[PDB]
Structure 1
Amino acid sequence: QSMSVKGRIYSILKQIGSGGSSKVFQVLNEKKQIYAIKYVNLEEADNQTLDSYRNEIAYLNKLQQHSDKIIRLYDYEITDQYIYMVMECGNIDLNGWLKKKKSIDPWERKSYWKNMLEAVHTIHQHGIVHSDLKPANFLIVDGMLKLIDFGIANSQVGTVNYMPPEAIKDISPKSDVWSLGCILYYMTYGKTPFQQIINQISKLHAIIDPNHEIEFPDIPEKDLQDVLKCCLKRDPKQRISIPELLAHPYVQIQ
C-alpha cells in the first residue's frame, strides 16, 4: 500500500475514516513522519459539488495562518479525477473520545471549550458560519481541539441534537453558538439537551417550543451552568455571541 502527493511518496498504514466519495488514511512520508491523507473521488461530483470542495480547500488553506485550532493542511494534489490532501493526523475525533470516556475532567472540558471558541471565532472572522457543528467536526491533536471542516464542502450524518431553533424554521454566527452550547452541555451533563426524545419529529418540535424548558441541573461550576444557559437561548437575539463567550468568567477565571 502506497501513494504520491506532489511527487512526495506516502506509505498508507490504516483507513481512519470513510465517506461517500471521501476516504481518510493514516500515512507516513519519505522522512517517516506521520500524516493524514484525505482522498476525494471526483468521478461522480457535479460542478456545484466541485466548487464547494475548491472553496472549502481555499478557506482551510487561508485560515491555516490565522489559528492553530484549525487542522493543518501541509499540501494537496487536485486533478479532475481526484483530490489528495496531506493534513495533520489527530489521535481521535471529539465524538469518538466522548463516546469512550465515561467521566470528563472539568479542566479538560474548559481547555476543550476554549479551543472550540478560538476555532469557530476564526471562521466567523472570515464570514464563515459552519451551521452544522457536532463533536465529529473537532479533532484531538495533543490535548488540543482542532476544527476539521467549515461546513462548505458537501462523521455524525443527519444529527438534529445540535441543531439551532432558527435552522429548523428554514442562520447567523449565533447558530454556531447553539451547536457549541449543545457540545458543552454533553460534556457537562452526559447527554445533549434533547437526547431523551427518540422521535425525531417530536425532538424537532421540542427545540423550537419555548414551553419545553431545557433542564439545567445543579453543578459545582456555576460559571459552566451560566454558559449553557446563555448559549441555549432559542431566540438568536437573546443568545450570547462568540466574542462575549471569550470574555465569560468560565473561560477567563483562574
Structure 2
Amino acid sequence: ECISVKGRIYSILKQIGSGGSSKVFQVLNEKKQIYAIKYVNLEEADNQTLDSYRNEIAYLNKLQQHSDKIIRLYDYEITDQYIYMVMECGNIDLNSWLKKKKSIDPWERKSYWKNMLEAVHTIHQHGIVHSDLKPANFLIVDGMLKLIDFGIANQMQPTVNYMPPEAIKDMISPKSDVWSLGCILYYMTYGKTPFQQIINQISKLHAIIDPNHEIEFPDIPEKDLQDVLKCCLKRDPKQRISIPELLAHPYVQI
C-alpha cells in the first residue's frame, strides 16, 4: 500500500502500467504531490533485461537537461533486487485521450505535433531511435505532450499499425520514427491510423510494405498538414522527410 525510495514514503493511489518484471503506480508523497513510480523486480531477470533497464535510467537522466518534452526523473533507487524510478505523473496518455475526443482543435493538434517533434528530435541528437512510437508513449501534462520512454526497455503497457515498412522489410535509421509519428499525426487528423481498417494482421504487414497499396489523404483545409502526412508516410526512408526538415515545415512555422 506504500512505496519507499531513498528514504521517502509514497502512498499508492493506483497501478497504471504493467509488463514483464515491472509495474507503474500513480502515487503521493507526504506533501500530497503526485508522481509516477516505476517498480522493476530484478530477482528473476536476464542480463539483457538488466542492461536495457540500466541504459534506460542513464539516458532518461542525461536527456532531462536537454528538453522539457521528456518525462522528468526526480529520483531512483537501484539494487541487485529492484529498481524504483520517481517520475512526473501526467494527466492522461495520448492513446486514452484520443479515444474520448469527438474531434481535435486543429491548433491543439499542431501544438502536440510540435511537442512530439521536439521530444523525438532530442532523443535523435543523443543517437537514440525509439523504433516503437505509439500514442501510448506520449503524456499530456499542462496542455503539452511529453515522451514517456525511449524504446530501450519495452515490457511496459497501459497493434502493428505504427510499424514502418523498413522494420518489416528487414528479414534502422531515425526515419523509422518519422513514419510512426506520421501514423500518430494521421490518426489525429483523420480519426484513424492509415491501415486501421485492414482487419487481420498478416494482411496489415502486406499493405504496409506493398508499393501498389496507396494510402488515402483526403482533402482537408490545412494543405500544409496534408503535405506533412504525405512526406512522413513515404515507404522509402531515403525519400521520407527528416525531423530537421519537419521542424522547418510551414505546418509548424507559418
Cα shift at 1:156: 8.9
Partners of 2:17 and 2:157 within 8 A in 1: no
Measure the CA separation in 1 of the matches of 2:112 and 2:137.
13
Match of 2:74 in 1: 74
Deviates more, 1:1-10 or 1:186-195: 1-10
Partner of residue 52, structure 2: 52
15-24 vs 58-67, which moves further: 15-24
Once residues 3 and 201 of structure 2 are traced to their aligned partners in structure 1, the CA distance between those partners, rounded to angstroms, is 42
Q: Deviations over 1:93-141 (max 9, x none)?
A: 0011111112111011001000000000000000000011100110111
Bigger mean CA offset, 40-49 vs 209-218: 40-49
Q: 1 CA distance for matches of 2:56 and 2:49? A: 11
Give the 3 Å change call, closer, same or farther, for CA 156–188 of structure 1 in structure 2. Answer: farther
1:142 and 2:142 correspond: yes
CA–CA distance in structure 1, aligned partners of residues 40 and 96 of structure 2: 23
Shift of residue 31, structure 1, vs aligned partner:
2.2
Distance change (3 Å), C-alpha of 1:246 and 1:87: same
Deviation (angstroms), 1:155: 8.7
The Cα offsets for residues 40-59 of structure 1, whole Å up to 9 and x where unpaired, read as 11122111110011001100
How far the C-alpha of 1:63 sits from its partner, in A, is 0.3
Distance 1:39 1:196 in 2: 36
For residue 158 of structure 1, report the CA deviation from its aligned partner. Answer: 13
Which aligned segments of 4 or more residues in structure 1 are displaced greater than 3 angstroms? 154-158
Report the alpha carbon displacement of residue 33 of structure 1 after superposing the two structures with TM.
1.6
Q: Residue 22 of structure 2 contacts residue 156 of structure 2 at CA under 8 Å; is this kept in 1?
A: no
Q: How far off its partner does 1:176 sit? A: 0.2
Q: Over residues 168-224 of structure 1, what are the superposed CA-to-partner deviations in whole Å (9 max), with x where a residue is unaligned? A: 012100000000000000000010000110111111011101111100001011010
- Aligned counterparts of 2:111 and 2:218: Cα–Cα separation in 1: 22
**For the Cα contact (< 8 Å) 1:53–1:154, is it kept in 2?**
no
Separation of aligned partners in 1, 2:140 and 2:234 = 28
| Length-normalised TM-score, structure 2 | 0.97
TM-score by length of structure 1 reads 0.97
**Contact 2:20/2:155 (<8 A) preserved:** no
| Structure 1 residues 178 and 93: alpha-carbon distance in aligned structure 2, compared to 1, 3 A threshold | same
**What is the identity percentage for the equivalent residue pairs of Structure 1 and Structure 2?**
97
Report if aligned partners of 1:42, 1:83 keep a CA contact under 8 Å in 2: yes
Gaps of 5+ in 1: none
Q: Does the 8 Å CA contact 1:49/1:154 hold for their aligned counterparts? A: no
1:75 counterpart SS class: strand
| SS of 2:66 mapped into structure 1 | coil
Query: Aligned partners of 1:33, 1:165: CA distance in 2, in Å?
Result: 43
RMSD: 1.5
Structure 1 position 26, deviation (Å): 1.2
Structure 2 CA distance for partners of 1:184 and 1:169, relative to 1, 3 Å: same
Q: 1:234 to 1:26 in 2, by over 3 A?
A: same
Partner of 2:180: 179
